[PDB]
Amino acid sequence: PSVDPTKVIFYQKKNFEGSGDTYAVGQDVSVPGSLNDKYFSVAVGASAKVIAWQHYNETGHYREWTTSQADISDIGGLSRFRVVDDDTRAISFLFKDATGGADKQYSLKVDARDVGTVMLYSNDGDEYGLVGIMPEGGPPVTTAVYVRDEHSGVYIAVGSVYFEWNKDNGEVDVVENEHWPKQLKSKRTGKSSFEVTLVDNKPS
């Protein structure tokens, strides 16, 4: 339909039918099961955006709804969402391994305090994990990270990642400082998405 630009309306049926529950920018909502136990479609205000993810596990699985969606019945079991400004960024990682390991041989644990702990596995497909949410010009954030060989149990590296808003580019930047594991390389894949690659499997 046509809604308040800083609001979103979730509807019980597909194609925006029924009364709908309205939510405002700033609301963070967690449900007992999945979002689909109540909602099948969502109208998104012109200045709003929804970031939805899974708070009952550490997969980091998420979706962004930036425009009205007439069918959200098939989104995985996403169970939490935040209504944010249109220019607020979902920070996401995909974890790769260039050292010749098996699928899921390595894990990257990211202790995101806003969206919750995420456990990413190496070369485990194409689904990014949500590891933070940063408003435009938001405060910088440090998040602890842990790189482990899951087979052996041995930690390759322990450190942290520093996110900051880049005002010039209107982007999120990963700053690789002295606590960023030298064994990892980040590569930008979007305004706030990064492929993080294990380039060396020798422990610190």
CSV table of all heavy atoms in Angstrom, one decimal, residues 119-145:
chain,number,residue,atom,x,y,z
A,119,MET,N,28.4,-17.9,14.5
A,119,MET,CA,29.4,-18.9,14.1
A,119,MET,C,29.4,-19.2,12.7
A,119,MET,O,28.4,-19.8,12.2
A,119,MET,CB,29.2,-20.2,14.9
A,119,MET,CG,29.8,-20.2,16.3
A,119,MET,SD,31.5,-20.6,16.1
A,119,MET,CE,31.5,-22.3,16.0
A,120,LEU,N,30.4,-18.7,11.9
A,120,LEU,CA,30.5,-18.9,10.5
A,120,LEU,C,31.4,-20.1,10.2
A,120,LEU,O,32.5,-20.2,10.9
A,120,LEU,CB,31.0,-17.7,9.8
A,120,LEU,CG,30.1,-16.4,10.0
A,120,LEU,CD1,30.7,-15.2,9.3
A,120,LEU,CD2,28.7,-16.7,9.5
A,121,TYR,N,31.1,-20.9,9.3
A,121,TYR,CA,32.0,-22.0,8.9
A,121,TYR,C,32.6,-21.8,7.5
A,121,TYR,O,31.9,-21.2,6.6
A,121,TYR,CB,31.2,-23.3,9.0
A,121,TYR,CG,30.8,-23.7,10.4
A,121,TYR,CD1,29.6,-23.2,10.9
A,121,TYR,CD2,31.7,-24.3,11.3
A,121,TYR,CE1,29.2,-23.5,12.2
A,121,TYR,CE2,31.3,-24.6,12.6
A,121,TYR,CZ,30.1,-24.2,13.0
A,121,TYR,OH,29.7,-24.4,14.3
A,122,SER,N,33.8,-22.3,7.3
A,122,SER,CA,34.5,-22.0,6.1
A,122,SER,C,34.0,-22.8,4.9
A,122,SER,O,33.6,-24.0,5.0
A,122,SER,CB,36.0,-22.3,6.3
A,122,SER,OG,36.3,-23.6,6.8
A,123,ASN,N,33.9,-22.1,3.8
A,123,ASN,CA,33.5,-22.7,2.5
A,123,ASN,C,32.2,-23.5,2.7
A,123,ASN,O,32.2,-24.7,2.2
A,123,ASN,CB,34.7,-23.6,2.0
A,123,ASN,CG,36.0,-22.9,1.8
A,123,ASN,OD1,36.0,-21.6,1.7
A,123,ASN,ND2,37.1,-23.6,1.7
A,124,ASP,N,31.2,-22.9,3.3
A,124,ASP,CA,30.0,-23.6,3.8
A,124,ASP,C,28.8,-23.2,3.0
A,124,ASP,O,27.7,-23.3,3.4
A,124,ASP,CB,29.8,-23.4,5.3
A,124,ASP,CG,28.7,-24.2,5.9
A,124,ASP,OD1,28.4,-25.3,5.3
A,124,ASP,OD2,28.1,-23.7,6.9
A,125,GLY,N,29.1,-22.7,1.7
A,125,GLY,CA,28.0,-22.2,0.9
A,125,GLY,C,28.1,-20.7,0.7
A,125,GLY,O,29.2,-20.1,0.9
A,126,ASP,N,26.9,-20.1,0.4
A,126,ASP,CA,26.9,-18.7,0.0
A,126,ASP,C,26.1,-17.8,0.9
A,126,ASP,O,26.0,-16.6,0.6
A,126,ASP,CB,26.3,-18.6,-1.4
A,126,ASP,CG,27.1,-19.5,-2.4
A,126,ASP,OD1,28.3,-19.6,-2.3
A,126,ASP,OD2,26.4,-20.0,-3.3
A,127,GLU,N,25.6,-18.4,2.0
A,127,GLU,CA,24.8,-17.5,2.9
A,127,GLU,C,25.7,-16.7,3.8
A,127,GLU,O,26.5,-17.2,4.6
A,127,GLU,CB,23.8,-18.4,3.7
A,127,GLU,CG,22.6,-18.9,3.0
A,127,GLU,CD,21.5,-19.4,3.8
A,127,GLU,OE1,21.6,-20.6,4.2
A,127,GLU,OE2,20.6,-18.6,4.2
A,128,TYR,N,25.5,-15.4,3.7
A,128,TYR,CA,26.2,-14.5,4.6
A,128,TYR,C,25.6,-14.5,6.0
A,128,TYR,O,24.5,-14.9,6.2
A,128,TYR,CB,26.2,-13.0,4.1
A,128,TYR,CG,27.2,-12.7,3.0
A,128,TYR,CD1,27.2,-13.2,1.8
A,128,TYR,CD2,28.3,-11.8,3.3
A,128,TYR,CE1,28.2,-12.9,0.8
A,128,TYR,CE2,29.2,-11.5,2.4
A,128,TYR,CZ,29.2,-12.0,1.2
A,128,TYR,OH,30.1,-11.7,0.3
A,129,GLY,N,26.5,-14.2,7.0
A,129,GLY,CA,26.0,-14.0,8.3
A,129,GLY,C,25.9,-12.6,8.8
A,129,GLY,O,26.9,-11.9,8.6
A,130,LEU,N,24.8,-12.2,9.4
A,130,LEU,CA,24.7,-10.9,10.0
A,130,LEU,C,25.5,-10.7,11.2
A,130,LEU,O,25.3,-11.5,12.2
A,130,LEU,CB,23.2,-10.6,10.3
A,130,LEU,CG,22.8,-9.3,10.9
A,130,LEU,CD1,23.0,-8.2,9.9
A,130,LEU,CD2,21.5,-9.3,11.6
A,131,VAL,N,26.5,-9.8,11.2
A,131,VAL,CA,27.4,-9.7,12.3
A,131,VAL,C,27.3,-8.3,12.9
A,131,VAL,O,28.1,-8.0,13.9
A,131,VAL,CB,28.9,-10.0,11.9
A,131,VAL,CG1,29.0,-11.5,11.5
A,131,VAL,CG2,29.4,-9.1,10.8
A,132,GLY,N,26.5,-7.4,12.4
A,132,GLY,CA,26.3,-6.1,13.1
A,132,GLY,C,25.2,-5.3,12.4
A,132,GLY,O,24.8,-5.6,11.3
A,133,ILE,N,24.8,-4.2,13.0
A,133,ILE,CA,23.9,-3.2,12.4
A,133,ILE,C,24.5,-1.9,12.7
A,133,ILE,O,24.7,-1.6,13.9
A,133,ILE,CB,22.4,-3.4,12.9
A,133,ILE,CG1,21.9,-4.7,12.6
A,133,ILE,CG2,21.6,-2.3,12.3
A,133,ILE,CD1,20.4,-5.0,13.1
A,134,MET,N,24.7,-1.1,11.7
A,134,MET,CA,25.3,0.2,11.9
A,134,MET,C,24.5,1.3,11.2
A,134,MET,O,24.5,1.3,10.0
A,134,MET,CB,26.7,0.3,11.4
A,134,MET,CG,27.4,1.6,11.6
A,134,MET,SD,29.2,1.7,11.3
A,134,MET,CE,29.8,0.6,12.6
A,135,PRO,N,24.0,2.3,12.0
A,135,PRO,CA,23.3,3.4,11.4
A,135,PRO,C,24.3,4.3,10.6
A,135,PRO,O,25.5,4.3,10.9
A,135,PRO,CB,22.7,4.1,12.6
A,135,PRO,CG,23.6,3.7,13.7
A,135,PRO,CD,23.9,2.3,13.4
A,136,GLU,N,23.8,5.1,9.6
A,136,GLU,CA,24.6,6.0,8.9
A,136,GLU,C,25.3,6.9,9.9
A,136,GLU,O,24.6,7.5,10.8
A,136,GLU,CB,23.8,6.7,7.9
A,136,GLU,CG,24.6,7.7,6.9
A,136,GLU,CD,24.8,9.0,7.6
A,136,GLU,OE1,24.0,9.4,8.4
A,136,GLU,OE2,25.8,9.7,7.2
A,137,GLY,N,26.6,7.1,9.8
A,137,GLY,CA,27.4,7.9,10.7
A,137,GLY,C,27.3,7.4,12.1
A,137,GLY,O,27.5,8.1,13.1
A,138,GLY,N,27.1,6.1,12.2
A,138,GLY,CA,27.0,5.5,13.6
A,138,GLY,C,28.3,5.4,14.3
A,138,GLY,O,29.4,5.7,13.8
A,139,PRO,N,28.2,5.1,15.6
A,139,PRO,CA,29.5,5.0,16.4
A,139,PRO,C,30.3,3.8,15.9
A,139,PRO,O,29.7,2.8,15.4
A,139,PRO,CB,29.0,4.8,17.8
A,139,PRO,CG,27.6,4.2,17.7
A,139,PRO,CD,27.1,4.8,16.4
A,140,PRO,N,31.6,3.8,16.0
A,140,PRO,CA,32.5,2.7,15.6
A,140,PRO,C,32.3,1.5,16.6
A,140,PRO,O,31.8,1.8,17.8
A,140,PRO,CB,33.9,3.2,15.7
A,140,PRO,CG,33.8,4.3,16.7
A,140,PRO,CD,32.4,4.9,16.6
A,141,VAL,N,32.6,0.3,16.2
A,141,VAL,CA,32.3,-0.9,17.0
A,141,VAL,C,33.5,-1.8,17.0
A,141,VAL,O,34.1,-2.0,15.9
A,141,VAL,CB,31.0,-1.6,16.5
A,141,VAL,CG1,30.9,-3.0,17.2
A,141,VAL,CG2,29.8,-0.7,16.9
A,142,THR,N,33.9,-2.4,18.1
A,142,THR,CA,34.8,-3.5,18.1
A,142,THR,C,34.1,-4.7,18.6
A,142,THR,O,33.4,-4.8,19.5
A,142,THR,CB,36.0,-3.2,19.1
A,142,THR,OG1,36.9,-2.2,18.6
A,142,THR,CG2,36.9,-4.5,19.3
A,143,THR,N,34.4,-5.8,17.8
A,143,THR,CA,33.7,-7.1,18.0
A,143,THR,C,34.8,-8.2,18.1
A,143,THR,O,35.6,-8.3,17.2
A,143,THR,CB,32.7,-7.4,16.9
A,143,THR,OG1,31.7,-6.4,16.9
A,143,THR,CG2,32.0,-8.7,17.2
A,144,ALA,N,34.7,-9.0,19.1
A,144,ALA,CA,35.7,-10.1,19.3
A,144,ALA,C,35.5,-11.1,18.2
A,144,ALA,O,34.4,-11.5,17.9
A,144,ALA,CB,35.6,-10.7,20.7
A,145,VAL,N,36.6,-11.7,17.7
A,145,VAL,CA,36.6,-12.8,16.8
A,145,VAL,C,37.5,-13.9,17.2
A,145,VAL,O,38.6,-13.7,17.8
A,145,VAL,CB,36.9,-12.4,15.3
A,145,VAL,CG1,35.9,-11.4,14.8
A,145,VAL,CG2,38.3,-11.8,15.2
